[PDB]
Subunit: 115 residues, 4 copies
């Protein structure tokens, strides 16, 4: 798994479960093409997003459906979603983990890029 | 000022100065229309983004050009930008402060909403 | 005001009001001596914590009473408090803003240091 | 492992390696007693901090040596350390993960408490 997403809930102190995660890759015509998607498991991760063959260099967007998550918990959210946009560059062997920490009026994201 | 943006640098421990901030509003055809833009001052804020008359109900996107900021400091950044997407004024006019905290491989954002 | 504290609530999207803030300074015997304390106003800040004369070089601790804040809102919190520990004025007098963002199971803090 | 600590670096986009982690438990006399310690591995975690038998209810403090970490990377840090203080209550079967995200002038922490 060269691309992993981990979503945590800062209100309940737990992984954010049943969250929709959509991944897009910037096409040559500058539009966002669907790339991969899933729903977070009990661990807060959508399993098997992509492969080493499909995940080439490019600009990617990871859209997390935070609005549906907070609505399902009966909590009033601020954001429509959380979108993380980054260039993936292969320098040496690399795996990307995009971690997101959610609060109703805030989110934090970080990337963990390992050899 | 019904819409304020405050940008901080978590590496240098200071306001993030000379950062481009672009605001868009979702059109009826689902596209992102330009709404307002500016550059952060010494306080990390772009002054005078919009007015109470222009800032109507709708879906807004605040895009912070974090990539050009880190490149100007000679630091290799991960993200293309930091984008915050939210519905504004659905229950009547509100004042919105969007705060962003930047690191080369991470960012946090929060909203402070007042009547 | 050489030492400022700003506290925000990531659940409600507002300043965290009526929060107790306690400041200590490390004594020569390595114990924590009381230095200053206050209560956050409607803006999420305790006004007038210290002066340029009193705020000398040293190691300071800013303890934010997040537990009483969440209990007063009927929300079960994880942390006993949020504590920020730092050396101040080692290279000469500076102005320090300690910003804290609160969630029931998480907090973020950042420092903005200016000459 | 009922108590886990995970430390990430927001500047390098990686786990924070070789970071000292010290855990204390509040004694009946209100002092902080040493409980467990270790140094983070390649994954940003100190392995085998405690056991289900030793990790009883109480008030715990997790101190992360962020200052030595940033100094070892040649980066000027703000904080002396990052301290996370919380009550551990057993309601049902529970595991605690304390996650910390580090920047030179900022840190974020969250707790993940699972059944």
């Amino acid at each position: 798994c060269p691309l992993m997403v981990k979503v945590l809930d800062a209100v309940r102190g737990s992984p954010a479960i049943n969250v929709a995660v959509h991944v897009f890759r910037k096409a040559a015509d500058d539009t966002w093409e669907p790339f991969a998607s899933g729903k977070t498991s009990e661990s807060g991760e959508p399993h098997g997003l992509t492969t080493e063959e499909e995940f080439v260099e490019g600009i990617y967007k990871v859209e997390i459906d935070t609005k549906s998550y907070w609505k399902a918990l009966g909590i009033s959210p601020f954001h429509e979603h959380a979108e993380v946009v980054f260039t993936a560059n292969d320098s040496g062997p690399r795996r990307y983990t995009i971690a997101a920490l959610l609060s109703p009026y805030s989110y934090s994201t970080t990337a963990v890029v390992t050899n």
